[PDB]
Ligand binder design. Structure first.
Ligand SMILES: [Zn+2]
Ligand SMILES: [Zn+2]
Ligand SMILES: [Zn+2]
Length: 243
């Protein structure tokens, strides 16, 4: 997903997902300790720095190849042979964040938490879970899709307090892997012969431009909502583990 702006949701689908996940936690009055949300907000600058750093600097964005932002659950690999993937990377920062948190280094903690949440968010993007890059056929579709997502994401907010609490075990890798599995299952709802043909025709046809966008909207809605619920449960796990 996009993360074009550091502290605004406008063109930062990642921040939006996290914010909506936090809202889910706030809406839950039965199992969530609201002081957790208070801490996330207290150290929001650092949290957001982390979410934004993933796509903008080393080592997080792997020299602009973003290799660590992909993870295919069936073979456990990213799109570049031998490169680190999103499961191990997201878990890495989940733990670093936790250790810092326990050592009372809050800025370090939430900065790393932000990074981890970013990686978890990415595996929820079907293309990231299927190693479909902006270079994959049809080339350019990946970027155009994520930009389009920002224009409609606000129409898919989860409005209840039902995050996926204890969705997977205590291992963050299981959560990242699990989210990727579901995302890959939904891949064909975004990338298929129809969307590929229409995207290509969009080059010289406004009709087809609106066509593929409409076509990928329903599944995009599903992915955004799933991403919010999973992220909410992941954050809850983090606090349960290190708090
Ligand atoms: Zn992303
Ligand atoms: Zn992407
Ligand atoms: Zn990313």
């Amino acid at each position: 997903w996009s993360a074009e702006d550091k502290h605004k949701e406008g063109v930062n689908s990642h921040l939006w997902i996290v914010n909506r996940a936090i809202d889910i936690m706030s809406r839950n009055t039965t199992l969530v300790k609201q002081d957790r949300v208070a801490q996330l907000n207290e150290w929001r600058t650092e949290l957001e720095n982390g979410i934004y750093a993933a796509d903008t600097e080393n080592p997080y964005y792997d020299n602009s190849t973003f290799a660590s932002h992909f993870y295919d659950p069936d073979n456990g690999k990213t799109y570049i042979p031998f490169a680190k993937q999103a499961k191990e990377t997201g878990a890495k920062y989940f733990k670093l964040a936790g250790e810092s948190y326990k050592n009372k280094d809050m800025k370090q903690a939430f900065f790393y938490l932000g990074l981890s949440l970013h990686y978890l968010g990415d595996v929820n993007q079907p293309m990231h879970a299927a190693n479909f890059t902006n270079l994959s056929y049809p080339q350019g579709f990946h970027s155009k899709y994520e930009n389009f997502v920002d224009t409609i994401k606000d129409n898919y907010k989860v409005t209840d307090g039902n995050g996926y609490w204890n969705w997977k075990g205590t291992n963050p890798e299981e959560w990242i892997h699990g989210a990727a599995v579901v995302a890959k299952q939904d891949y064909s709802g975004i990338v298929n012969d129809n969307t590929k043909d229409w995207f290509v025709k969009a080059a010289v046809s406004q009709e087809y431009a609106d066509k593929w966008r409409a076509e990928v909207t329903p599944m995009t809605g599903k992915r955004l909502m799933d991403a919010q619920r999973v992220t909410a449960g992941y954050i809850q796990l983090w606090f349960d583990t290190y708090g």
